[PDB]
From Swiss-Prot, chain B:
This is Beta-lactamase OXA-10. GO terms for cellular component: periplasmic space; plasma membrane. Dimer. It catalyses: a beta-lactam + H2O = a substituted beta-amino acid. Class D beta-lactamase which confers resistance to the beta-lactam antibiotics, including penicillin, carbenicillin and oxacillin, and also some cephalosporins. Confers weak resistance to some carbapenems, in E.coli strain C600Z1. Acts via hydrolysis of the beta-lactam ring. Has penicillin- and cephalosporin-hydrolyzing activities. Disulfide bonds join C23-C30. It comes from Pseudomonas aeruginosa. One of its GO terms (molecular function) is penicillin binding. Belongs to the class-D beta-lactamase family.
């Protein structure tokens, strides 16, 4: 992994502290704006839905690709029936809290170990460790995890990895496909900021690029930078056009 | 299946002779504009890439989802095909030479077997192994495409579930958090004024927790009308609230 400090310009103009990690073909060929931050570990927030969904399927907590998460009857979002894809792609706190409780802590721990997922610390509450608990993961580790999923190399069936991968598709054109996932822990303060993420991969013609971005957030209006900074960096590398 | 005569309005403007079949939830609930036409059988043209890809994977001719189909540098009919392509790419830019080569490696005995299992059309692959779907005798109806695509959606085709899922991702054409379209076009050519060609668009839409299966075909003798194969069906779906 090499450092490209010229990438800092994209963060500085907005006064944001963050990191971007980008790898072409494999995790053997990565660059970042900040080597130190690239390996610092942050709460995953909703990026945890990726491993949670896979564990859910492997264990049977989630039955199959076509399962519907029906509303039982504070957020409008949480009052609608959702597909797995819908649950991943829109806000659905109650769905994932229930999946995590059903998996349980022993099984959750085994899978995080198999996946080499961050610090693998799930204390803080079975239904909130990824959001207000002790779990932490680096941008580097995100890229490594996502590459394994891309290749179907996680300790999970190929079918379940494929199911999760379809649910992560967010942009589609004939020769350009994007799988990605945001995460956001909440707006913190200047001295105790939250963290926001954007992770995924881009398949462009026959190349693949893995990416992971994170940033400290203390101002609600800065949230969209989680997509625009990586996009600008990717653009300057020639990926987007 | 019932007939929705009001849908004809979308064909009258452009004088198109064709048919749209739309099914909500499953193929046990279908509507179409032309009952006669819905079961009539036509050359599938590039819509055949869907079973061809599944069969390619099942036979091991296509190695896995990440297989790259390398360009040898020699002229192809379309500039868009003159490059290395992934499986998704090859399908989406409808790279005929890539799939002709797949067919040849699959071969007639295996192809016949899989189409029988898939209940694909008239299952007639005479006309040469690398052209039966383009200029040969293979024929499938809009209602048959819908049956086949539902099986694929449900993973009920006689192929591994992994392979059905691979082809499924390769067919994604429109994505949003609660909206996903999987689709494939086809076009046989312009034929003559008297024996015109056929144009297709087939697929399914997942909107919130519902699924809609659809197929459309139309007669065509002028290439400039090609886009109506998407625009007509799209107009009917949007008028039904599928957007």
């Amino acid at each position: 992994i090499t450092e490209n400090t010229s990438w800092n310009k994209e963060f500085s103009a907005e006064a944001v502290n963050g990191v971007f990690v980008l790898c072409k073909s494999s995790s053997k060929s990565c660059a970042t704006n900040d080597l130190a931050r690239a390996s610092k570990e942050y709460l995953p927030a909703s990026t945890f839905k990726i491993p949670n969904a896979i564990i859910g399927l492997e264990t049977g907590v989630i039955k199959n690709e076509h399962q519907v998460f029906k509303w039982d009857g504070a957020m409008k979002q949480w009052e609608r029936d959702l597909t797995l894809r819908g649950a991943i792609q829109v806000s659905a706190v109650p769905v994932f809290q229930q999946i995590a409780r059903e998996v349980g802590e022993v099984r959750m721990q085994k899978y995080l170990k198999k996946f080499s997922y961050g610090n693998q610390n799930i204390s803080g509450g079975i239904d909130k460790f990824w959001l207000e608990g002790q779990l932490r993961i680096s941008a580097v580790n995100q890229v490594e995890f996502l590459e394994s999923l891309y290749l179907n190399k996680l300790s999970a069936s190929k079918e379940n990895q494929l199911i999760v991968k379809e649910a992560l598709v967010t942009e589609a054109a004939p020769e350009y496909l994007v799988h990605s996932k945001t995460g956001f822990s909440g707006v913190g303060t200047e001295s105790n900021p939250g963290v926001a993420w954007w992770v995924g991969w881009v398949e462009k013609e026959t190349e693949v690029y893995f990416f992971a971005f994170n940033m400290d957030i203390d101002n609600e209006s800065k949230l969209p930078l989680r997509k625009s900074i990586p996009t600008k960096i990717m653009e300057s590398e020639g990926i987007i056009g």
